[PDB]
Amino acid sequence: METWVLGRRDVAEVVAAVGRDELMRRIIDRLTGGLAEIGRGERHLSPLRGGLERSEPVPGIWEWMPHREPGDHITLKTVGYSPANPARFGLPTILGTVARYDDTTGALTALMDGVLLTALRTGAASAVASRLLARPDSHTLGLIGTGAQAVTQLHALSLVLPLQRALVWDTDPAHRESFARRAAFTGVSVEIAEPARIAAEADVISTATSVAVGQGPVLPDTGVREHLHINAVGADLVGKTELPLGLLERAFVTADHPEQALREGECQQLSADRLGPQLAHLCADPAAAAGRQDTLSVFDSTGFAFEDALAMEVFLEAAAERDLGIRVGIEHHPGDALDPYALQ
Amino acid sequence: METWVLGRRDVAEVVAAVGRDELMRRIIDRLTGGLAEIGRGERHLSPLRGGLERSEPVPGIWEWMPHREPGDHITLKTVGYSPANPARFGLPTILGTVARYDDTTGALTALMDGVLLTALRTGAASAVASRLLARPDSHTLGLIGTGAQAVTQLHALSLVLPLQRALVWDTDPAHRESFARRAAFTGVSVEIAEPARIAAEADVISTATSVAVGQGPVLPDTGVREHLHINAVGADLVGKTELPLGLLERAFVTADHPEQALREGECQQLSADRLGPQLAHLCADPAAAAGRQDTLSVFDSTGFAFEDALAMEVFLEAAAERDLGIRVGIEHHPGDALDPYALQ
Numbered sequence: 288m289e290t291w292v293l294g295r296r297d298v299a300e301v302v303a304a305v306g307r308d309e310l311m312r313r314i315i316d317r318l319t320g321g322l323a324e325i326g327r328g329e330r331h332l333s334p335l336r337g338g339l340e341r342s343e344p345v346p347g348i349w350e351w352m353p354h355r356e357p358g359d360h361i362t363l364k365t366v367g368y369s370p371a372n373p374a375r376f377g378l379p380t381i382l383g384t385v386a387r388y389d390d391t392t393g394a395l396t397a398l399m400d401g402v403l404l405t406a407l408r409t410g411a412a413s414a415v416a417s418r419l420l421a422r423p424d425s426h427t428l429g430l431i432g433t434g435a436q437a438v439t440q441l442h443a444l445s446l447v448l449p450l451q452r453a454l455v456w457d458t459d460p461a462h463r464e465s466f467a468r469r470a471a472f473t474g475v476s477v478e479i480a481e482p483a484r485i486a487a488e489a490d491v492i493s494t495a496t497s498v499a500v501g502q503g504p505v506l507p508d509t510g511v512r513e514h515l516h517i518n519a520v521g522a523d524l525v526g527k528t529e530l531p532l533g534l535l536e537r538a539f540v541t542a543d544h545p546e547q548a549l550r551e552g553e554c555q556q557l558s559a560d561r562l563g564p565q566l567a568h569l570c571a572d573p574a575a576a577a578g579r580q581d582t583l584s585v586f587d588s589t590g591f592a593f594e595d596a597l598a599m600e601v602f603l604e605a606a607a608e609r610d611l612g613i614r615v616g617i618e619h620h621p622g623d624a625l626d627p628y629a630l631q
Numbered sequence: 632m633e634t635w636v637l638g639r640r641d642v643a644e645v646v647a648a649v650g651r652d653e654l655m656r657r658i659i660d661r662l663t664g665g666l667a668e669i670g671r672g673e674r675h676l677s678p679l680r681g682g683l684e685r686s687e688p689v690p691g692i693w694e695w696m697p698h699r700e701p702g703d704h705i706t707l708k709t710v711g712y713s714p715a716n717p718a719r720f721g722l723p724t725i726l727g728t729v730a731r732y733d734d735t736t737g738a739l740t741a742l743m744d745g746v747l748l749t750a751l752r753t754g755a756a757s758a759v760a761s762r763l764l765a766r767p768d769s770h771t772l773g774l775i776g777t778g779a780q781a782v783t784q785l786h787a788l789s790l791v792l793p794l795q796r797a798l799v800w801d802t803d804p805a806h807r808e809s810f811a812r813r814a815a816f817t818g819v820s821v822e823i824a825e826p827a828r829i830a831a832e833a834d835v836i837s838t839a840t841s842v843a844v845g846q847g848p849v850l851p852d853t854g855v856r857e858h859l860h861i862n863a864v865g866a867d868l869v870g871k872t873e874l875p876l877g878l879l880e881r882a883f884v885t886a887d888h889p890e891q892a893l894r895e896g897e898c899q900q901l902s903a904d905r906l907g908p909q910l911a912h913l914c915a916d917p918a919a920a921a922g923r924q925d926t927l928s929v930f931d932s933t934g935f936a937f938e939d940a941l942a943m944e945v946f947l948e949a950a951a952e953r954d955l956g957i958r959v960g961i962e963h964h965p966g967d968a969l970d971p972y973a974l975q
């Protein structure tokens with residue numbers, strides 16, 4: 288028994304071989320089915336994630352995210368949010384890895400990058416929610432925050448809605464100027480637009496910013512279109528929010544993970560009484576979502592480990608077919624199971 | 632940047648080059664100093680661990696154990712307790728791995744086996760406690776449970792006490808009969824003896840069994856020597872205990888981690904106001920242990936992530952000295968930190 292490790296090169300090869308659209312579509316499809324299974328009581332929400340706050344160089348958090356498929360495997364994503372990483376170190380803000388363990392024995396069976404996988408399933412989750420809650424003829428996407436997540440927000444949403452235009456904003460001029468180049472592969476025309484213009488003109492919005500605790504909202508509470516759907520994607524520290532309270536109180540709100548959203552999502556701003564069914568229940572019966580397409584809706588996204596497990600499976604399937612990755616004996620399996628010193 | 636991976640081969644070469652005795656002594660010494668640092672308020676107990684219960688093929692648990700050194704790094708041990716592993720799969724009951732993450736960036740910097748390390752630091756912790764609370768001329772060790780942990784319990788204790796014999800019991804006849812061969816290198820003569828005889832004759836006892844929830848005690852409530860010290864090491868599911876309540880109520884009880892021990896240790900059986908000072912406090916200020924060698928004492932051991940971080944440091948120091956291990960690029964670090972697809 289050895290651990291199957293996908294290098295950064297292998298993850299790159301999966302993308303190049305499968306194609307960006309096809310890979311994202313596979314993850315959207317797996318996520319929509321898995322969420323419906325939860326909504327039907329065939330699968331269960333992952334446990335609350337845990338985390339450790341860090342104050343330097345700027346406030347961030349490092350988290351562990353487990354999910355168990357009984358009798359099959361356990362998934363654990365370890366992921367940091369370190370918003371000074373791009374400017375100070377040329378590293379992504381979100382940095383992580385995903386491990387798979389055999390549920391029967393505990394053995395570490397696979398390990399891979401979490402950076403790309405996280406961005407993919409986070410875009411996919413927004414596409415799942417927006418397919419349910421945005422107008423099917425949605426033409427204009429708004430993006431507040433044009434960092435890493437914005438790229439897969441636009442990509443995934445462009446696969447499920449007839450987007451013709453993306454109105455985008457970032458507080459860092461260099462980050463908003465570069466977004467059109469990073470988004471060019473989607474074919475959707477990008478325009479820089481200030482938040483009040485995005486609020487007024489967009490059919491669907493994703494907010495995905497590194498805004499600090501207490502420094503929201505990143506979108507003003509002003510004229511929004513009656514049918515607006517928002518994916519509230521930013522999530523890290525307790526006390527970080529992105530949307531104005533008055534907008535949230537007006538909206539139909541659905542969370543991906545209700546207990547996580549109440550602690551780390553926009554639902555921090557609301558009472559537990561106030562929320563609708565969770566995304567899994569809307570996937571299982573979209574009748575509850577159809578009648579909210581033409582009114583104000585918010586998908587409160589925090590990310591949960593089930594999404595990472597499903598995305599990892601897509602990557603492992605593609606990598607196995609192409610004989611990608613290395614095998615590394617990491618765990619010590621003594622020749623005598625009762626002798627820790629029996630190094631084989 | 633690449634992750635430093637210590638393969639099972641690298642861990643084997645560290646212990647082969649350094650030797651079991653010296654490597655165990657290094658971990659005993661580092662654990663002693665680190666515990667005293669906690670007792671002096673210079674460092675802090677790890678947060679409570681978390682886990683997922685698994686019922687098949689027998690009840691077990693899979694846990695995550697984080698410990699943060701602020702500004703430096705975060706350690707995470709992932710470890711399963713799967714008590715059917717030896718008989719069913721030829722695998723150790725305790726199967727795990729230990730990772731290190733940079734606290735500033737979040738990046739995965741090091742990854743190694745947790746099987747040997749866990750056995751080493753668990754023996755070491757009992758040795759730290761027994762130096763404080765067992766008679767310094769203790770001659771007879773008792774072991775209830777002669778599986779994997781029993782090997783390093785005997786080894787560690789033989790380095791800090793003048794042990795001449797070990798009286799040992801297991802409910803599996805094959806496992807108690809094989810213990811003498813696994814223990815031979817220590818030079819401590821091994822004799823199989825029923826638990827009542829072990830209770831009557833031992834100067835120090837370690838209990839380290841895979842007894843099921845509700846099926847304790849593994850040591851009977853009967854006559855023991857006035858000075859007996861017990862390392863209660865068994866720990867996994869809530870409701871699993873090893874010692875008889877009557878014995879516990881007469882003992883001076885020090886826990887490695889009070890909150891964890893009240894949940895998962897022998898202290899599950901005790902009112903919280905009956906606990907003695909935790910082990911870290913005994914290490915920083917021996918006034919609390921003065922005179923307790925000569926009466927009944929119990930070290931309630933549950934294991935906590937600080938111990939794994941300290942033992943990992945010992946391994947990484949030896950591995951760095953010898954340039955052992957491999958570098959694997961696992962995390963995707965895009966050339967453009969704001970572009971997850973820049974598979975750069």
Ligand SMILES: NC(=O)c1ccc[n+]([C@@H]2O[C@H](COP(=O)([O-])OP(=O)(O)OC[C@H]3O[C@@H](n4cnc5c(N)ncnc54)[C@H](O)[C@@H]3O)[C@@H](O)[C@H]2O)c1
Binds near residue numbers: 368
């Ligand atoms: N919900 C999920 O499943 C999930 C998954 C991954 C990341 N996230 C979260 O999404 C957020 C963004 O992550 P990322 O990887 O895109 O980070 P990033 O650092 O790559 O991008 C964040 C961008 O936000 C910009 N920004 C900061 N404050 C702003 C403001 N007030 N208005 C507009 N823009 C602002 C920054 O300039 C930066 O360009 C983080 O909170 C992250 O933790 C959520």
Ligand SMILES: NC(=O)c1ccc[n+]([C@@H]2O[C@H](COP(=O)([O-])OP(=O)(O)OC[C@H]3O[C@@H](n4cnc5c(N)ncnc54)[C@H](O)[C@@H]3O)[C@@H](O)[C@H]2O)c1
Binds near residue numbers: 724
């Ligand atoms: N305190 C810590 O830090 C720490 C660290 C590692 C493991 N543990 C715990 O120690 C315990 C033993 O772990 P291990 O790795 O030695 O497992 P193991 O499976 O190698 O050995 C356990 C032994 O206990 C025996 N046993 C079961 N019920 C018994 C009973 N009533 N009386 C006597 N023997 C009995 C089994 O036959 C087996 O040989 C587990 O609960 C484990 O989770 C604690």
Ligand code: PRO
Binds near residue numbers: 366523589
């Ligand atoms: O779900 C995730 O992976 C990210 C991590 C930070 C915020 N949510």
Ligand code: PRO
Binds near residue numbers: 710866934
């Ligand atoms: O501290 C530890 O590693 C072990 C794991 C199971 C029981 N406690």
Ligand code: NA
Binds near residue numbers: 519
């Ligand atoms: Na959110």
Ligand code: NA
Binds near residue numbers: 864865895931932
């Ligand atoms: Na215990």
